[model samples]
Target: MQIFVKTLTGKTITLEVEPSDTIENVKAKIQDKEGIPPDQQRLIFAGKQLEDGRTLSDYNIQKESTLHLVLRLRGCKXX
Candidate 1:
């Protein structure tokens, strides 16, 4: 399945994934391509947050679906 992600900078990323792919799985794809850590990826669909353990199917996210990505900035904690 394919989906779109809108990043914080208004960039739209095109992604393809399996029905069994978890939110964490998708995060890594963005991490490698966009240089944002998986831990920093906050994906939301229909105003609902996506959990690491949950699959895109769980959220009813479909082909060409668009998910919004919000960044999780450091508060001077992690190095």
Candidate 2:
């Protein structure tokens, strides 16, 4: 099954992952795409922190469902 995920920057990307894909797996994927460090990755879905090892099935996520992933960059100061 495939799921559509939206990033904080308003970018949408789709992935063909099994329902068994864990939240940590998704996080890793997003980091790969955005070049964001794992330590800097903050992803919240369904108004909660997506814990590591929690699968889509654990979250009751269905195929073709849209998941909102938010990433906040830290250690940046305005000029």
Highest lDDT against the true fold, candidate: 1
Assess every candidate by TM-score: 0.89, 0.74
- TM-score computed on alpha carbons, candidate 2: 0.74
For model 2, the stretches where C-alpha displacement exceeds 4 angstroms are 73-79
The Cα local distance difference test for each model comes to 0.90, 0.77
lDDT (tens digit, per residue) of candidate 1 on 43-72: 999989899999988989999999999988
> lDDT tens string, model 2, 1-79?
9888887677888877888888778777877887767666665666777777889889888888777776566676776
CA shift at 28, candidate 1, in angstroms?
Answer: 0.4
Error of 2 at 67 (Å): 1.9
Evaluated with TM-score, which candidate comes out highest? 1
Candidate 1 weakest lDDT stretch, 10 residues = 70-79
